[PDB]
């Protein structure tokens, strides 16, 4: 008579690990409840057909899992929160924001360079990254290094670094290496003054059907209030800038002393044009849960009716406030130019 909770996952190693970690946490709250993990790999030729824009191989993967949700083949999927756009299709929502892992970008160094930092690499060292945000910030901070795209999966990146002669280092998210059990490869954790992280980096988001109240009820136990509020602010900031996908936008948040701090910035692709500012608001981390009404609208794609709504609205307002500041200083022109340049391919 029950529902069996079907959990859809991509087939990549990191996605499978993330999915299973969320399932384990759910089973800890709901022992005996039946879960079924369903791995999906279907070639998404039909989603590219309907697209009026270039999608990209990664963005295609997210759309494929929403298709599984829409067709009632699975009941929830687990994403890195930074892979979920700030505007979701109307039938979907993020029903859980899990406790954040390390949000910072990290450096892995060529083995001859143990003990080094980007600051102490030889001039003209070649550093691999395929992220426009990382390349923009790091080119500005480190004008005497060379930042180049690097092809392949993580295992290929690390093999190229250990075996070949091109790259002195690579940049990637600390959280990915953490989840791979490979934190011992990290040689430097980048601070906001070197490289601020992507909106939502390090948090997992659970996507579900927007009106599937039974599943929303179950997964709401996963919401971490502090991570929820930080990520609402980061995503509201990004949404309100109204830039395209991918262009260089980065953030830093902290909740401390009863305050929520949000730093946000935009960069041209080469890093030479930038605007960054910090704002704060008095918001404390709620310790109580609640049973908010089903009519409450989601906030930047997130349904968290069991967490007090006042602080969520305040976090959203902080992000909007900071976006409006950046826009009054010319952020739209920086974002538009970056989008047009990145639309060349
Ligand atoms: C319009 C619009 N679209 C999107 C979806 C979207 N997100 C990104 C961010 C992204 N993702 C990755 C790959 C990655 N994902 C998770 C990890 C591990 C760390 C973690 O769990 O947080 C990784 C790898 C890693 O960082 O080490 C990257 C890295 C580059 C890559 O492999 O593709 C990034 C970019 C970055 O961090 O700077 C993207 C961009 C992907 C790209 O490289 O261009 C996209 C769009 C796409 O797939 O084309 C968003 C959400 C962005 C956000 O919230 O951060 C938006 C924003 C909007 O609505 O305005």
Residue numbers in the entry: 17 to 361
Sentences from the paper on this structure:
The structure of the mutant R173W-hPBGD agrees with the ESI FT-ICR MS analysis, representing only ES2 in its reduced form (denoted R173W-ES2) and thus revealing for the first time an AIP-associated mutant trapped in a reaction intermediate state. In contrast to wt-Eholo, the active-site loop Ser57–Lys74 in R173W-ES2 is reoriented toward the C-terminal helix, α33, allowing the accommodation of the additional pyrrole rings in the active site cleft between the domains 1 and 2. In R173W-ES2 presented here, the active-site loop is oriented in a significantly different conformation, partially facing away from the surface with Lys74 establishing several interactions with C2 and S1. Trp173 has different side chain conformations in the two subunits and has two alternative conformations in subunit A. We also discovered rearrangement in the helix α22 (residues 170–179) in subunit B. This rearrangement allows Trp173 to adopt a completely different conformation than seen in subunit A. From this point forward, we will only discuss the structure of subunit A, unless otherwise stated. The substitution of Arg173 with tryptophan introduces a large hydrophobic amino acid, predicted to hinder the cofactor and/or substrate interaction severely. Both ESI FT-ICR MS and X-ray crystallography show that this mutant accumulates the ES2 intermediate with a greatly reduced turnover.
Porphobilinogen deaminase (PBGD; EC 2.5.1.61), also known as hydroxymethylbilane synthase (HMBS), is the third enzyme in the heme biosynthetic pathway. PBGD catalyzes four consecutive reactions to convert porphobilinogen (PBG) into hydroxymethylbilane (HMB), a linear tetrapyrrole heme precursor.
